[PDB]
Every structure is written in structure tokens, then in C-alpha cells.
Amino acid sequence: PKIKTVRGAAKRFKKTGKGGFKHKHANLRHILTKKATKRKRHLRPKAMVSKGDLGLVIACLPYA
């Protein structure tokens, strides 16, 4: 058979131009009002995936 994609990985990551992955930062869902606005401003753009993380991510997204 063909390989199945881990679908939560396809909901979490997106492929970019040089083959890296972009993801959303993880602290911005709830109790934000005790977080400073500098924290919430810095957690707002999409980041890139680090390299041991990239090794574990490439296995879960085998197609795209």
C-alpha cells in the first residue's frame, strides 16, 4: 500500500520554499490576560521548525 499521512501533522505544519516547515507557536490559546503583551506579540507570527524536530516531522509528513 501507500503510506498514510499523520493527519494531525498535516493540520499543524506547512511546507515552505526551501523544504522547511512552518508552525504556529504554542501559548496563545487561553488565559492570556496574565501574559504580557510583548509575549503575545512575539508568539503571533508563524515560526519555523528546528532540526531534530525536523527529523521527527519529515517522517510524519511523507508526501507534503
Partner: protein, 96 residues
């Protein structure tokens, strides 16, 4: 993606965005295949008859990669800035 019972990386991060259904029916074309079409007119029909886009494609951009030299007439396709510059400099009418 098993990390030893630690919560995995694809489950530690928030899922984001949605999937649009209009992005499947849109195919950008470059200018290099603009000479590949039969005849000198470029519309949806001849772009499908020349195997450039596909059957389910409804919309197209004709963006600037390069290599356009002949007068072509583009009908109903959205054209970018630099692409319409290079097309009108090649000679043919951009839209009618």
C-alpha cells in the same frame, strides 16, 4: 512521532488555518508555455486542449517567469503586473 511518552511535537502545537476549495480549481501558468498553445489565442479552452492546466481548472494567472516573444491574445485570464508588461512588449493585446 513517538517521543517516549512525552507529548509529541505534532500534538503539542496548535492546528491553524483551514483549507479553501477554490485553490484546487486555480492553476497559474508561466509565459514559457504561452507559445505552446495551438493558435495564437489563450483562453481556458485552448489551455486545456494544449495540456497546460487540466480539466477541473476554472481560473488561471499568467505570471512572469519568462520567455515570451510572439503576439498572443489572452482572454478572461487574470494577468499580473510584470506579465502584462512582458506580453504587451511582445506585442499582443492583453485582454479583450
Amino acid at each position: 512521532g513517538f517521543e517516549g511518552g512525552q507529548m509529541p511535537l505534532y500534538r503539542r502545537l496548535p492546528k491553524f488555518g483551514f483549507t479553501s476549495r477554490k485553490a484546487a480549481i486555480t492553476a497559474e501558468i508561466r509565459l514559457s508555455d504561452l507559445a505552446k498553445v495551438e493558435g495564437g489565442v489563450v483562453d481556458l479552452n485552448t489551455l486545456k486542449a494544449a495540456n497546460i492546466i487540466g480539466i477541473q481548472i476554472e481560473f488561471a494567472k499568467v505570471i512572469l517567469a519568462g520567455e515570451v516573444t510572439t503576439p498572443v491574445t489572452v482572454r478572461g485570464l487574470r494577468v499580473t503586473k510584470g506579465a502584462r508588461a512582458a506580453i504587451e512588449a511582445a506585442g499582443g493585446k492583453i485582454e479583450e
